């Protein structure tokens, strides 16, 4: 607990919506960065958050190329302005769905 934070609110880099809160990191695996590359050969640092808010989950989910065993993902875009911020996973264990965002696509700010 303190006084005025600066670091407690996740927004969309390049609009502002809302999305997340660092209250809501969760440790996969024992840490809530995982560093992953795509087919494509992207590398994203990844932040885990058991909650998220102002995305859209586009499609069905695929098990595919998963980064987290056991679970099944969606693209989550930015709900306003469209950016790729991530992922959503479900179908998994303990717990049975999480959010995987792109940190460098996310601005940390105050409440
Ligand atoms: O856990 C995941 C999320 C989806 C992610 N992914 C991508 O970022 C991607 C880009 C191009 C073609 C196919 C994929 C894909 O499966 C990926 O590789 N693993
Ligand atoms: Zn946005």
New binding site residues.
């Given amino acids: 607990m303190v006084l005025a934070p600066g670091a407690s609110i996740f927004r969309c880099r390049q609009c502002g919506q809302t999305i997340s809160r660092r209250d809501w990191l969760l440790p996969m695996g024992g840490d809530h960065e995982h560093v992953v590359f795509?087919?494509?050969g992207?590398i994203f640092r990844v932040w885990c958050f058991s909650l998220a808010q102002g995305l859209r989950l586009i499609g069905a989910p695929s098990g595919?190329?998963?980064?987290?065993k056991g679970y099944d993902?969606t693209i989550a875009l930015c709900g306003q302005c469209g950016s790729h911020l991530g992922?959503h996973y479900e179908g998994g264990s303990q717990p049975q769905t999480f959010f995987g965002l792109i940190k460098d696509r996310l601005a940390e700010g105050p409440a």
């Avoid at 595919?64 to 987290?68: G, K, L, N, P």
């Fill in positions: 795509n087919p494509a992207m595919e190329f998963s980064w987290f993902w992922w």
